[PDB]
Design a protein around this ligand. Structure first.
Ligand SMILES: *Cc1cc2c(cc1C)nc1c(=O)[nH]c(=O)nc-1n2C[C@H](O)[C@H](O)[C@H](O)COP(=O)(O)OP(=O)(O)OC[C@H]1O[C@@H](n2cnc3c(N)ncnc32)[C@H](O)[C@@H]1O
Ligand SMILES: *Cc1cc2c(cc1C)nc1c(=O)[nH]c(=O)nc-1n2C[C@H](O)[C@H](O)[C@H](O)COP(=O)(O)OP(=O)(O)OC[C@H]1O[C@@H](n2cnc3c(N)ncnc32)[C@H](O)[C@@H]1O
Ligand SMILES: CCCCCCCCCCCC[N+](C)(C)CCCS(=O)(=O)O
Ligand SMILES: CCCCCCCCCCCC[N+](C)(C)CCCS(=O)(=O)O
Ligand SMILES: Cc1c(C)c2ccc(OC[C@H]3CCCNC3)cc2oc1=O
Ligand SMILES: Cc1c(C)c2ccc(OC[C@H]3CCCNC3)cc2oc1=O
Lengths: 494, 499
């Protein structure tokens, strides 16, 4: 019934906000639509897998907030297997390699690839993390799709196909669906291309022992009966002295303040009194989430390691159901598994198939890329189609179509009276990730502590000391990477 | 509590659905979120204006369903004033003209303008009205914005700027916001560029005497207590024998079937049990409505007519708050008024101002465009910003961003168990208009009459006899219009000749 703060959503962001406010001595209630906490994180347990992350899973260096919060909750990480060679599958053939980027041999293709990645970072350097709409060319970049940018930038079909896979994998959307400005901000706010794509020393370095679901479950353990499961919020009334929050099961919660810790567009599922201001009313109809099926095939052994493959597969072209895989084997070498993403339009296309039809297609693909008949002998399969989730809207995160970030981006974390806005979408560092969820929840919680006079304005945004367990190594480039000309550059010299 | 059909939404679509079901002897309830019917139609009455349409207003030739429904309810139409000259205002100067398109004198520019409109209509003939995703190049056209298409098509800035204003005015969105496939579908399903842009012989020919709001009000009069105002629907449950529909004021309705007659994205405001199928679940997060403020400035007299201007202004420029106006004077010649639209990004930008500051900007623009100091002497002002409507999401209608119509378009009007979809967005002729609202409402009602075994499948889709009151002149071209080359075609002819 009555409390200091109602948090809408029991994901990492809502749970992080509620823990900070509870630790500061306020009475918090978390209203959660599902029969579970964790949202876009979900750990399934069974005897066949022990545990598997079917939603968010990976953490890496520079993600210091999720690493600190998890360490405090008693969680440990292990390294994603990258001891042996990565595979680039192009034109029906496997090319094993080492290092984060697949090698390119044709000298014109080399210049075009090198220029693509370098240009993404060059453009990112002019985009403020906390205000991408303040980029000097914000309207020019916001009014084109990543498809138009790649058409201008990529002189080779080779580079244009790899850059397309890169967009699809990063933001689970087609190049023609997303703003160039938003995508370039998205990469820049994760620390750039090398950091976002890397396993070793990047975003995919590590997983949590026992699953990422434990972050939200263990915060729920701390809060006890303050977390209300199967309480979808339907109605928020800010006309009276206290804020009133109503759930679908007809419960009424009364608070001084509300944290909205749900994806922006899921704001549409709530009736507001008074109506939302115009810009937010329209913004929450304009910000979809991407489309992905996460698929884990289990094997008796990590057989790819015998051929000096780590299990990472980068798979070009339309025919492949999965464009990208990682070794999902447990640190002990047991529960051997390959994790694959069915991305964007393929998620929509292959959703029509049965679970068994998807398994056969994945196994046949992996047999070709790994060059082993052992890929045809799976012992177990798990998958999750995030497109079908009423209380997520998709995965991994919210993308901005062309024109939306410059016109509406400012409204994303603007408070509406006594509603403050959390969720990974409102973060300024690793927005879209579990790290962003923690940044946003803690910031929204501290905006309410300041509204209450408990902390000064300069304590709303707080830096995070570096993890001792997962330190970041510097991102380096070579002299040639920095100075080799583009393809049009090599032409102007001829 | 119990009925045959719950209709969610008391706009024109839901009320047309409800009237048809009621006339076929079913028990219907209409659950309307607002304290009024009409939705994106709203007629304000006060002593200063007598009546004014602040939402949908115009009807024209080929909109035979809204004309028939309106006439059955006892309503009359009158013609929007197009007796005197139209104005094209470009680069700070006014160029008066007659006929639907501003004339172009520069021959290269003429070839580019002619080719622009022609290509719009040529591409449109490739696109089936009822399945735009089946166009041969659906994918290629859907992966392009209208901005990219105009950049390829328009060899002059003059044609590009006019084409930009055309998109802004048609679908209240920027060229870079909208799918080229969707926009080309949208124009073609209205009968093509000439029909959609014309006053005389087009979409803007007429208004209802007394306002368009009377359509929804008069159907509510026929239905009595069956219409429930201030019942926003929050929850639909299909797990049991009867469909359960719950409202925000805690009332429960039980029906055999539901028509959803709300903009597609406003389906997000409803919690579904069981959850929607995947494709609809995502589709309703991907289909925003456009942005528009409708502004009516009142004057002592229609002073523009005395300079032989009908009141129609087509105004190019970033600085102009309004890109399009029509005479909104009553048919009696009194309550002299100019209607203008503040479109797309300008609706966002100028919403920051006061009502009085917007009125002042509009009067200054009208003064310059009409060359008239009288435009600075308004007697009254009415405006409505549709961006702020929780239960509309915007106006006029839903647009599709790049990639969405090919991936998700097939599920727009696909039933979900015992939920059928009405609303203008599900129409195949004048989708986005009051006409499309009637088509979709009556089609959805008949889908249910079919499901109940009351009519055969061939009666779900039913054609409409032509209005005898508003007959349609056919859309014609001249030989030159059909066969003049584009600018790149002229350059090809030159390259060939000189060889
Ligand atoms: C799905 C997914 C996500 C993902 C990814 C792969 C997949 C398949 N891989 C990731 C990774 O390897 N590393 C990483 O850091 N992130 C990865 N992502 C994304 C990541 O999971 C998300 O960024 C993160 O989980 C976001 O958390 P946040 O707390 O911001 O949002 P949420 O999890 O969606 O939580 C929202 C909660 O709110 C509830 N909800 C929704 N509507 C209501 C109403 N009306 N009332 C009450 N509660 C509501 C949701 O049910 C949810 O629990
Ligand atoms: C706003 C506008 C529209 C318009 C236009 C100019 C403006 C500024 N000019 C038009 C014109 O000149 N001629 C024309 O034919 N159309 C024009 N448009 C478009 C026109 O208004 C619309 O196409 C038409 O009115 C749409 O009708 P439809 O019946 O499909 O949709 P609706 O009017 O939006 O009605 C929906 C009703 O549902 C209610 N609602 C919404 N959510 C709920 C829930 N959860 N529960 C119950 N009811 C709900 C809305 O309140 C609304 O009444
Ligand atoms: C050749 N492509 C790469 C198609 C265009 C060059 C882009 S630009 O000409 O440099 O804008
Ligand atoms: C050479 C000038 C390009 C002219 N524009 C109209 C800019 C592009 C035509 C595109 S296309 O060449 O017709 O595909
Ligand atoms: C969740 C996840 C992300 C976001 C992610 C984002 C980018 C990414 O890049 C790896 C590829 C991109 C294509 C070119 N080389 C390396 C890999 C990723 O792996 C992942 O598991
Ligand atoms: C509702 C409405 C529409 C959709 C509408 C759509 C197009 C339109 O075009 C007239 C312009 C287009 C640009 C070229 N000259 C004449 C005018 C319109 O006036 C309207 O009131």
């Amino acid at each position: 019934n009555k409390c200091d703060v109602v948090v809408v959503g029991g994901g990492i962001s809502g749970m992080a906000a509620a823990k900070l406010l509870h630790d500061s001595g306020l009475n918090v209630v978390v209203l959660e639509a599902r029969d579970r906490v964790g949202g876009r994180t979900y750990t399934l347990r069974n005897q066949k897998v022990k545990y598997v992350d079917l939603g968010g899973s990976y953490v890496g260096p520079t993600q210091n907030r999720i690493l600190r919060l998890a360490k405090e909750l008693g969680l440990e990480t292990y390294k994603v297997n990258e001891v042996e060679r990565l595979i680039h599958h192009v034109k029906g053939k496997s090319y094993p390699f080492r290092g984060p980027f697949p090698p390119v041999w044709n000298p014109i293709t080399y210049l075009d690839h090198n220029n693509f990645w370098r240009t993404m970072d060059d453009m990112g350097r002019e985009i403020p993390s906390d205000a991408p709409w303040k980029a000097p060319l914000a309207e020019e970049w916001d009014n084109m799709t990543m498809k138009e940018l790649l058409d201008k930038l990529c002189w080779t079909e080779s580079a244009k196909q790899l850059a397309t896979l890169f967009v699809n994998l990063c933001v689970t959307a087609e190049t023609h669906e997303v703003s160039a400005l938003w995508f370039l901000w998205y990469v820049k706010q994760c620390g750039g291309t090398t950091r976002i794509i890397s396993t070793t020393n990047g975003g995919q370095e590590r997983k949590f022992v026992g699953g990422s679901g434990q972050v939200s479950e263990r915060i729920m353990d701390l809060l006890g009966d303050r977390v209300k499961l199967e309480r979808p919020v339907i109605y928020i009334d800010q006309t009276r002295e206290n804020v009133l929050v109503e759930t679908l099961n007809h419960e009424m919660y009364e608070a001084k303040y509300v944290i909205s810790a749900i994806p922006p567009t899921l704001g549409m599922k709530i009736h507001f009194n008074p109506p939302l201001p115009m810009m937010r009313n329209q913004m929450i109809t304009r910000v979809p989430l991407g489309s992905v099926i996460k698929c884990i095939v289990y094997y008796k052994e990590p057989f790819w390691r015998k051929k000096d493959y780590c299990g990472t597969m980068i798979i070009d072209g339309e025919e492949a159901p999965v464009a990208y895989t990682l070794d999902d084997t447990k640190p002990e070498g047991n529960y051997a598994a390959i994790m694959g993403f069915i991305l964007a339009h393929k998620a929509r296309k292959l959703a029509r198939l049965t679970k068994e039809e998807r398994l056969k297609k994945l196994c046949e693909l992996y047999a070709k890329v790994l060059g082993s008949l052992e890929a045809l002998e799976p012992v177990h399969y798990e998958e999750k189609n995030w497109c079908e989730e009423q209380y997520s809207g998709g995965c991994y995160t919210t993308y901005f179509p062309p024109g939306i970030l410059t016109q509406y981006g400012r409204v994303l974390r603007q408070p509406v009276d006594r509603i403050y806005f959390a969720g990974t979408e409102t973060a300024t560092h690793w927005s879209g990730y579990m790290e962003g969820a923690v940044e946003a929840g803690e910031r929204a919680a501290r905006e309410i502590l300041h509204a209450m006079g408990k902390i000064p304005e300069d304590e709303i945004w707080q830096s995070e000391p570096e993890s001792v367990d997962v330190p970041a190594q510097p991102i380096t480039t070579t002299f040639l990477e920095r100075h080799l000309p583009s393809v049009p550059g090599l032409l102007r010299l001829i």
